[PDB]
């Protein structure tokens, strides 16, 4: 009478996994993390190590600035709210032994725990 193809469900990453497996690794080319121009082209192991370590240090500097001044990036301009992009909050609340104890496992340190045991 009528034939209908059945529906399927995919992961958002599965399509791009297919696209990536379609293509092999780039030949005669440094990793994608490194730039393409020849001057910035890291041409040795030690200097490349130092380079991506400087990049990671910039990442840590970004973390430091964001967690030091959260109010600047507090605006959620993007329509999809993302905690990965939201600023980070390791701020102890007001004196409250029960909520402070619940926040212990959230702050991930030891001075708060000493003070709470006290």
């Amino acid at each position: 009478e009528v034939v209908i193809p059945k529906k399927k469900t995919w992961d958002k990453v599965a399509v791009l996994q297919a696209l990536a497996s379609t293509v092999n690794r780039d030949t005669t080319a440094v990793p994608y993390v490194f730039q393409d121009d020849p001057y910035l082209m890291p041409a040795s192991s030690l200097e490349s190590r130092s380079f991506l370590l400087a990049k990671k240090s910039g990442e840590n500097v970004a973390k430091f600035i964001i967690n030091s001044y959260p109010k600047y990036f507090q605006k959620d301009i993007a329509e999809p709210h993302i905690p990965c992009l939201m600023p980070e909050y390791f701020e102890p609340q007001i004196k409250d032994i029960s909520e402070a104890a619940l926040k212990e496992r959230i702050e991930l340190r030891k001075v708060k725990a000493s003070v709470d045991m006290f």
């Binding site: 209908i4 399927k8 995919w10 297919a18 092999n24 690794r25």
Partner: protein, 133 residues
């Protein structure tokens, strides 16, 4: 020489529910560069051909909007400066197109956008009658 042995394939599951039947996928691309539009349209039609579906194309007219500004700052009513925003249209219609084909093709093209283009999907799907009527 470096050719991988086992290509990692994503997981796929054919759910028991039947796939939806789109009657017509009519996409409308608005651009500023007719050459970029032509390249994008060639890309799209080649992808549709290689995927094995019907295709058709036509170019709606160019739309322009202009507004006049005073050329100078303080007092000059005679000498104005003009501008024009030109938007160029291109249509592509696809018929006899399954829901999963729509999903895969739209994912492909939506990752293959260029920057200075807007893309308007109109999806037409048929369905049976309700039960309460």
């Amino acid at each position: 020489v470096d050719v991988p042995k086992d290509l990692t394939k994503p997981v796929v599951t054919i759910s028991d529910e039947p796939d939806i039947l789109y009657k017509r996928l009519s996409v409308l691309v608005k651009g500023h560069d007719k050459a970029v539009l032509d390249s994008y349209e060639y890309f799209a039609v080649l992808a549709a051909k290689e995927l094995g579906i019907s295709i058709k194309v036509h170019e709606p007219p160019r739309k322009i909007e202009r507004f006049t500004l005073l050329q100078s700052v303080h007092i000059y009513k005679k000498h104005r400066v003009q501008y024009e925003m030109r938007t160029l249209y291109r249509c592509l219609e696809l018929e006899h197109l399954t829901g999963s084909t729509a999903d895969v093709y739209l994912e492909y093209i939506q990752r293959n956008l260029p920057e200075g283009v807007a893309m308007e999907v109109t999806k037409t799907q048929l369905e049976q009658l309700p039960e309460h009527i």
